[PDB]
Each structure stands twice: as structure tokens, then as C-alpha cells.
């Protein structure tokens, strides 16, 4: 899914599109037309301190 | 002529709050240097989104050009574009900003959309 720079650049493009949480990372999922999927760019779901800042 | 690296420095914040004659306007929020080609790109991209039946795009190009290549050194609050009505069409803020949104990316520094009359620079900044 395309990664938006921040939460403000995140819009709901269709009728069926939703806001969802991927482990504290806010994202948009459409059960129809998956090309509408948007992630907020943020840390990986699994990160250590030295590995990711 | 043959001006040094420190000349016409944009870095100061100006006291002049511009007056925009057009119904809407696009105004410099930061300091910077803008190429002519960038403003031409902006102009074309904005003219794509205008209802040419009711509107006219005015570009303020009359500022000095400084050697680098010739570009503009822009202070905060310098107006760039103006949406001027030919008729009774009154845009909202969403609409005007939606129009200038096309041409914002080509411009390298931050810009604000300001409504007719004098810039209220308490609200803008």
C-alpha cells in the first residue's frame, strides 16, 4: 500500500474504505479495490532500539 | 550588477503586509529563492484548474532577479498569484485552496492562500 507522509495526507477515497489500526500505525483499508490502501509511514511492527533508533 | 553572495538577502521578515487586489492570492510564507521556470510550471498547473470563463490568473513577476543563473529572492509575505473574477463567482476557501493546491508543489517554499483585501498576518502566521 502507498505510504502517506503523515495522518493529514490520508483520505478516504471510496464508499467502502475504512480507518484501521495496524499496531498503533494508522492506515486505510478498502475491502473492495485494494489499490486504495494507504499506510501512514512509521516504524516497523517489530523494532529494537539499536536496530531502529 | 555582479552582486556578491550576500545581496538582497531574503532572510529578514518584512513589515509589509501585502494587499491583494484579486479575489484570492498565493503568498510566500518563508524565505527562499525561486526559479522562473518553477513559477511557470505553477502557472500552467493552476490554469489547468481555473474556470477561464469567470477567472483570470495574475502572476507577480516584477521583482528583481538575482544571479546564482537568475532567480528571485523572496521574503516572507510576498504575493505570487492572484485569482481575479470576471463575474459574480465567489469561491469558498476550500475551492480557492483546492485551486492553488495544484501549483503549490512546483514552488520550493511554503505558501499560504489569502482572501481579498489586506493580509491579516495575525491569522496567517
Amino acid at each position: 500500500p502507498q505510504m502517506v507522509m503523515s495522518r493529514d495526507e490520508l483520505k478516504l477515497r471510496c464508499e467502502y474504505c475504512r480507518f484501521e489500526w495496524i499496531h498503533d500505525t494508522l492506515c486505510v483499508r478498502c475491502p473492495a479495490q485494494p489499490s486504495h490502501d494507504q499506510r501512514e509511514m512509521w516504524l516497523h511492527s517489530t523494532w529494537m532500539w539499536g536496530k531502529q533508533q | 550588477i555582479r552582486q556578491f553572495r550576500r545581496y538582497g538577502d531574503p532572510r529578514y521578515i518584512n513589515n509589509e503586509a501585502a494587499l491583494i487586489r484579486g479575489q484570492w492570492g498565493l503568498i510566500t510564507a518563508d524565505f527562499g529563492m525561486v526559479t522562473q521556470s518553477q513559477m511557470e510550471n505553477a502557472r500552467l498547473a493552476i490554469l489547468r484548474r481555473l474556470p477561464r470563463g469567470s477567472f483570470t490568473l495574475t502572476m507577480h513577476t516584477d521583482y528583481e532577479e538575482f544571479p546564482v543563473h537568475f532567480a528571485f529572492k523572496f521574503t516572507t509575505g510576498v504575493p505570487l498569484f492572484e485569482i481575479m473574477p470576471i463575474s459574480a463567482r465567489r469561491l469558498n476557501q476550500a475551492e480557492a485552496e483546492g485551486i492553488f493546491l495544484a501549483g503549490r508543489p512546483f514552488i520550493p517554499l511554503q505558501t499560504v492562500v489569502v482572501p481579498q483585501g489586506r493580509v491579516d498576518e495575525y491569522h496567517v502566521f
Binding site: - | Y12, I13, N15, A17, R118, V119
Partner: protein, 102 residues
């Protein structure tokens, strides 16, 4: 006041560009008197929303607002940028222990 640009300089330690002695309304009004010879009640000054909580505190170009109270008696309109306000322009420069205060 708006034509004038008040030069300001102080000391900065740490990494990002912060003053270790942030500004407040009693010493903005001080610089006004020091170099512009402008005497105003310091309680007419108001900061930006971001600078109310910590003071001014950051290096470089900052602006602040001065409230000029009485004019509708004088019929002040359209000959100024707005009837109640002046953008007071501060510039904070970091200098070492030789040239700075505080």
C-alpha cells in the same frame, strides 16, 4: 516598531538551536526601550501560541505581537496594516560567554 527589527543575542547550549534562557514579556519590552526608545506597558505584548508555554527560546527569526490600544478615536484605518497590532520582529543570535549575558 515594525519598521525596526530588534537585534537580540544570548547564549545557546545543547543540540538543536534553543536558548537556555528563554524570553518573556518583560525583556521584549526591554529591548524596545534599549534600542528603539519605545516605552510601552509590557502587559500589552502577547506571544505566539507556540511560544506562550515555553517562552520564545529558539534561535533565529521570531515574531511577537504588540497591542496598541487606543485608536478608534484617531480614526486609524487603512493607513496601517491593522488597527490594534504591530508585528514586533525579534532575531535571536547565539554568542559565547565573551559577548553574551545570562
Amino acid at each position: 516598531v515594525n519598521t525596526g527589527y530588534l537585534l537580540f543575542g544570548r547564549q545557546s547550549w545543547g543540540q538543536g538551536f534553543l536558548i537556555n534562557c528563554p524570553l518573556r514579556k518583560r525583556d521584549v519590552a526591554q529591548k524596545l526601550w534599549e534600542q528603539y526608545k519605545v516605552r510601552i506597558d509590557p502587559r500589552l505584548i502577547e506571544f505566539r501560541e507556540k511560544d506562550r508555554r515555553t517562552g520564545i527560546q529558539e534561535l533565529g527569526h521570531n515574531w511577537c505581537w504588540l497591542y496598541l490600544p487606543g485608536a478608534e478615536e484617531l480614526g486609524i484605518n487603512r493607513e496601517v496594516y491593522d488597527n490594534k497590532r504591530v508585528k514586533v520582529r525579534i532575531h535571536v543570535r547565539k554568542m559565547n560567554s565573551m559577548f553574551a549575558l545570562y
